[PDB]
Amino acid sequence: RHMRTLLIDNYDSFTHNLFQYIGEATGQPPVVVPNDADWSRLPVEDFDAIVVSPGPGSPGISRRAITDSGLPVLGVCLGHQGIAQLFEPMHGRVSEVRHTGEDVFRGLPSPFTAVRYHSLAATDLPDELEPLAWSDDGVVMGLRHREKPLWGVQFHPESIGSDFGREIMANFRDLALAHHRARRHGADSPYELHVRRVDVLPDAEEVRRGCLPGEGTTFWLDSSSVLEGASRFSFLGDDRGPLAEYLTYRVADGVVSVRGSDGTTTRTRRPFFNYLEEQLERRRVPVAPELPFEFNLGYVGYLGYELKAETTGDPAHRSPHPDAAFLFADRAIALDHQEGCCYLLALDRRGHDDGARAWLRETAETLTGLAVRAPAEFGIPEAAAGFGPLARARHDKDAYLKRIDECLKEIRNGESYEICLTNMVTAPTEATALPLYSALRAISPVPYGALLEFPELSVLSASPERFLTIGADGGVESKPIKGTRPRGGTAEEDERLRADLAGREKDRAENLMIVDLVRNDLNSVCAIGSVHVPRLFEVETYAPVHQLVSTIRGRLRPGTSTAACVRAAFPGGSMTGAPKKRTMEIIDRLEEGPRGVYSGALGWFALSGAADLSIVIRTIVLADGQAEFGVGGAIVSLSDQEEEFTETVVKARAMVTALD
Amino acid sequence: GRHMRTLLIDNYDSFTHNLFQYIGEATGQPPVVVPNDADWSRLPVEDFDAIVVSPGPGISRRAITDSGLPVLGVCLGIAQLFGGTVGLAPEPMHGRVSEVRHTGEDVFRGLPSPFTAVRYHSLAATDLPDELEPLAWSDDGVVMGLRHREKPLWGVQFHPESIGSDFGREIMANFRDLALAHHRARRHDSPYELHVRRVDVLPDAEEVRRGCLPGEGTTFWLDSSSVLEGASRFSFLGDDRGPLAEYLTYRVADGVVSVRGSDGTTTRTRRPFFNYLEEQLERRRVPVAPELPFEFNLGYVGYLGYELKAETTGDPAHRSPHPDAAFLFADRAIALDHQEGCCYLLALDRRGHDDGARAWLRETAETLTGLAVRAPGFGPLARARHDKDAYLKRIDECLKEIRNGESYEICLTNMVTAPTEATALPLYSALRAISPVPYGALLEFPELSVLSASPERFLTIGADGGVESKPIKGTRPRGGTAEEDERLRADLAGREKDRAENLMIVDLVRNDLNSVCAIGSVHVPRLFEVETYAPVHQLVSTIRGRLRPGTSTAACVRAAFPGGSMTGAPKKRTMEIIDRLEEGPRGVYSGALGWFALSGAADLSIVIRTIVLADGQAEFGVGGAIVSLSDQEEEFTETVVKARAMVTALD
């Protein structure tokens, strides 16, 4: 559903201006009720946010909305003064307003112009209210309640002489969504989360080898590249805990297989995304304030491409691997690469003591023993050599050139605007997961690296791509990568190719169409006005390749689960193309087989409702003495067949090099 | 009344939810999304006001052809449906930007040319049938915009909602506006029949009053005494001699509507005036005549008295000595086109009969052709209700209310009365020569004569439901030299006090228009523009909106009356202060004077710089904004300055 806003009219001549601004900012008009209306009569349960309009004179139902309701409230002028009390003269004149950039003022430049309609201001402010903004005149322009979701502005955002009025109203809408997403959680948690900070940062690979079994189900979410703003944390754990479970899914059957600490495999004939939504709602646990990350344990694993059968796609091909595979992590180790410390997370059932407090104690001793001095740290045409000596692509060059030709025909007939045509390469190897991964992470250090060691398969990911980062507050971020340029080797040819990638209209167009596609997916589950693009066509360089990256953000609608958001956006637009449904049908025909783990999502669903998912690219799947890795690229009207083939070989190089 | 219901047909493409967002933000209401494989039988198409047809790689055909509703086709349709060609573009372009140049018409209203748009097509429109018309072109010479010349169909061969496009929200709002215009038009079984003859001669306006209208009897002269391009162009003259003509007056005391037929009998009706006017305009609806370059379709010409506030948001604190409303139902009018130099004659028959309307046109056409060959302090005996000492204390009282936060701005006015041995026409002749204005008016009614030298636009409302208000607030006198005027118009635009006085009224009128206008439609295209007339320099701001569907022209006037530029903010509480301190009625002054067209259009001035003649005495209102920064002596002197035009004309 969309969000519901109550606009309380205090009988001033500005209520209808606020009506317009709320309407434009939130995409839904507020329900207007008079101040002297009956409170007990009003269906306040139906409403999700109150805007208290300016009134004449000094600070009826706007009092009850603040004290009792418990709903998000925005006080405008006399509503602001109302919040200040319950807990020089300028009319139609402008002041420069300076602020901290928090809550209703986020995104706004300091200063910004606003008009004031008052002779009275909040001089002595109560201890439970903090000021957020001041006029050049030196009176309080913004305030907040430190616990309750209450906000005040001592100016008219909707005044013609004011700037960023719509933004302030969009910010209040955003604050109210996050408040109602945080109210869903109560005393309903079936687990107690124990946290322990250890003041050592051992090498992540020492933690994997030293703390995790070696044999059995393990996960390692590996920030092998650490850069301020891009990546900060690594996560590791195993299935040895008493409350830990391993979950698999087959589309063909449509059954969820679940292995507990009983040893029993439970078969449920249902869809995975609904299964996950249900478990995540039932197993809800609130985020810890002591943690600088929002992964407070939960599900770690991958969603395979073929899960499209439950989204907007057809079950055309069977994967030989599970279509979904997740460890429910009851215990995990978190490395903070910025601050140089560790966090130990362990689940106890809210009533019981299942040795969670004991695991924190034991693994803390182990980790301090691994803390030792941190050790010391390709171009074309050799990058475009082959897939390796023992390797065999599903489609050889000729077969792939014909699939590209078929893509160009489908685009000429106007069936697709962009096709992400991919190939699958299978090479025999006797290599074990961890040694092979140790070589890969050294070759291609990356923000979204991962080693999953599951019974059916090992996943060795050197992905740099963010699919969905969802906060517990309902904030969504997607960083689609599309537009690739090889490295030069010669640092002259390299920075030349980097500049070529940012400038070429072809690559910009490849990226833009995916930005529009991901915007569309997000808009289907996000609040009207929340979906925006703060960064377009940023260049990111990694050991193997130069990548064109765009950033899309949104805010989930109330009643939309984190699982619902991923379903709406799965499979990733950056791995399908536009329009998605018809493009995935073209992909089904030309690829003549499954993608499997490749072009799916890999990451975690937290018990806090937060999530962080990568796109599975630059990944080796190890199963039964065989390494298989996907490679692909965008086909558009302007594409050259030879160049597009060469691009799939280049993208394989990190995986080809790791294997030998 | 209600908000517009937009339908969005989903043609199975990854663009629908982006269009959903942009329609939502632009119109303030999310569209209903319907799959293209829906059943048109079961679909309640009657409940929807507009259709957006999403791009594709169904019921879209029935939407454009059958439905007969406003349609915006984006990318994928209208071209091919009306026997147009779908031919290959010079270069296929998917997610590729181009500069779009356009005429600035319909969906392109207010967009700069060029603007940037993203394209997702390999096919374009080469040839276009007579019925279709191109509105926009790309930088590689491809049609980017079209419309049907009759049916309300618009085509856009780019994605407005694409991240790489600009002014996408503006395009969807423009389409919403056009959809409101189509639905306001289709509503306008007519009781009357409108006859129009163009006469390519322009006589002197004052000689048409003397020659064509009688010296005694009920007459009107809407006088563009000042004529400037895009400000004033037309003058309207008429009398009550017609067979269907009616004189209509109202009293707030009784709440009685008195209508006087051309037979001579007067029929009385107990009904709130705005509810009567709405009811009559709804009954007497006659479509716009596109032969006419003006919107006045015949109808009611007259004034709304300040005391009508008792039936809007105000209290009946004082009874006007004059009628609280007074309108001549003009069945016959002379229209002067000062730009093109021709006269238009409008005459009204009843649908059933022929009452010599065709005859009146031919006769007065010969009369006008004949005339065009001939002619192509407050005063010495004046008495203010409040003398200086009294008016200064009413300002002191205004300042008390402002310090106690009861009002942000009070428009405190005085009423001046002076005896005169002068008749309506000679006095107005002097007044219009002294102070040429766009909204000059001579209304000669039985109870009173109204001599308006108002430059101020209250509400200009088109038949398409487009509303404009130009509130004036911030005044300065003229100077002796041209160099003195430049200083004073520079000073008026610069002072914080005058800018504040004006801004608060802009916020007030925006609020009034938003109560009756579509979400997103209300904007201020011009803020703090200085206009110069004979008596003073005026600080003027322009406000625009579009009426909600099911909001009458009369309903819009009711919601905005009295004008914010003559009350202050907040209007309800400030009008109570005015009631207390003025100790009597304003009457015609600070009311609204103009016309209500049978087409649903209206053009109303604010009554300022106006003399009322009744019982052989002249009376005129003057006032000004009182704010926290107001000096009493200065505010009083301001009222004496604004009297100069009325005082010089009387002397």
Ligand SMILES: N[C@@H](Cc1c[nH]c2ccccc12)C(=O)O
């Ligand atoms: N880079 C993430 C953690 C992470 C590493 N590899 C991943 C793979 C999938 C999901 C998350 C991750 C962070 O800093 O918080």
Ligand SMILES: N[C@@H](Cc1c[nH]c2ccccc12)C(=O)O
């Ligand atoms: N100036 C208006 C007509 C007009 C003149 N005086 C008026 C007084 C009231 C209303 C309208 C008018 C026009 O050109 O169209």
Ligand SMILES: [Mg+2]
């Ligand atoms: Mg602004």
